[PDB]
Amino acid sequence: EVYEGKAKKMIPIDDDKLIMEFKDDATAFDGTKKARFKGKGWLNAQLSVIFFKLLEEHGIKTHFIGVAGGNRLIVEKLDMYPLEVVVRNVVAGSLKKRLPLPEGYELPEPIVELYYKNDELHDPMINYYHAKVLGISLDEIKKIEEIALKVNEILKDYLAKKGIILVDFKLEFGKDKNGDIVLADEISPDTCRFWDAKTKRSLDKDVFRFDKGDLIEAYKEIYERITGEKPEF
Amino acid sequence: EVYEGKAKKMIPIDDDKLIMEFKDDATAFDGTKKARFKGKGWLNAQLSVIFFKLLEEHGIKTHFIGVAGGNRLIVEKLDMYPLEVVVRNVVAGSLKKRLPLPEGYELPEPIVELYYKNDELHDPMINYYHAKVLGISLDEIKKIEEIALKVNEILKDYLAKKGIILVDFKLEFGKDKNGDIVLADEISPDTCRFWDAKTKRSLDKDVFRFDKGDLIEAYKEIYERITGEKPEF
Ligand SMILES: Nc1ncnc2c1ncn2[C@@H]1O[C@H](COP(=O)(O)OP(=O)(O)O)[C@@H](O)[C@H]1O
Ligand SMILES: Nc1ncnc2c1ncn2[C@@H]1O[C@H](COP(=O)(O)OP(=O)(O)O)[C@@H](O)[C@H]1O
Ligand SMILES: [Mg+2]
Ligand SMILES: [Mg+2]
DSSP: OOEEOSSEEEEEOSSSEEEEEEOSEEEETTTTEEEEOTTHHHHHHHHHHHHHHHHHHTTOOBSEEEEOSTTEEEEEOOEEOSEEEEEEEEOOGGGGGTSSOOTTOEEEEEEEEEEEOOTTTTSOEEOHHHHHHTTOOHHHHHHHHHHHHHHHHHHHHHHHTTTEEEEEEEEOEEEOTTOOEEEOSOOSTTTEEEEETTTOOBOSTHHHHTTOSOHHHHHHHHHHHHHSSOOOO | OOEEOSSEEEEEOSSSEEEEEEOSEEEETTTTEEEEOTTHHHHHHHHHHHHHHHHHHTTOOBSEEEEOSTTEEEEEOOEEOSEEEEEEEEOOGGGGGTSSOOTTOEEEEEEEEEEEOOTTTTSOEEOHHHHHHTTOOHHHHHHHHHHHHHHHHHHHHHHHTTTEEEEEEEEOEEEOTTOOEEEOSOOSTTTEEEEETTTOOBOSTHHHHTTOSOHHHHHHHHHHHHHSSOOOO
């Protein structure tokens, strides 16, 4: 059986591999807002590949194995932590409701937030003690955050050289058969906030969230600035 | 000028001392539910004194200096951290909305949660990174939690020998002139969950929160079980 999530489908290959297929569907505000954008899947697939390859070069262990053409990646099957790990460099989104700081406030150092993946409870934020009750040891949490913080440096530096501010982003992790902590899911304009360095405008899912313009146009601009090429689809 | 909070008034004495006066007012659900209970102030004052004295004996630094008769304590003036520090031994209250665990679930080890004191944002939970942005260093946070966890052991052990389960409780802290971290505010049936060991019933502000019975009767039962004496008022 294939798992069909809000944005991607996961097709089993064997015991240790999956196909991650990116859909054109977009959801927001915990699923209340919905639309489909032709080519969104392709862009998010291609961009994930570029980011995973960049991170692998820097010695980040990711689930990325290869491409299966189109909107499909081949990825290592992992035993997933029930976490969303959010790294924040610039104040935006939900952080404005947690710290009395304005949108665009540049953080002196990165913030890491842990969210417990649980639909029933609406993905509440947790700390290290909650994580322990969930079966995640302090060492594991520490290794996870150390990876997220390294990922942050690499992506923000890379993107800055392209005139893009990495505002924040969301990661997921799992364990491989050796018990190593492996970066999973996706890295795309769906799961990151990207702002133009010159204009400060959103080139990410916030365009869809708040009707700030044309989503495909914004995701394309990201692809074009990153690759140097115009997207083929 | 005197500071008048929801439950207590703080009267300045000199440069380094305050009077903490406990009122009969009770509030719940971030101030939406209100009532007054005659003698509540007295009970919460007396009980805070007993707890602060118990903790001082165990080498916990608290703001407790002495009594000024009635509902008034003399306390050291501190430069307060903008935090509420919650220690949890048994699942109850807001934790049920954060972990899919039932009320009464006994935790394998204590949970410490940090809340940023901010009316505008409704006291959101924060982690160590948020605390840093707020000007609280990691060392400070670590010392705070180490104290809270020690306080927990002492109170839970003490209360268990009296047939009372310490379910959770909320602490506040500030810095003294030497830059030491000093336990502040109050320790009472207002700020702790106390359950009868035999019956599991609430002997705390939850009685008022959820109309579980007579608040004064419940606070009295706590006083009587702790002191061995019937409250004089
Ligand atoms: N390497 C992996 N192994 C197993 N599961 C993964 C891996 N990477 C991502 N996942 C999970 O696969 C699903 C990806 O599809 P998605 O549309 O994002 O689903 P959802 O809407 O549940 O987040 C998610 O449940 C995600 O946690
Ligand atoms: N030692 C102390 N020094 C300075 N302020 C304190 C001390 N202990 C408690 N406080 C503060 O004094 C007030 C106590 O009264 P309270 O009725 O609880 O007010 P509030 O409704 O604002 O919590 C709180 O603002 C508390 O943080
Ligand atoms: Mg997802
Ligand atoms: Mg108070």
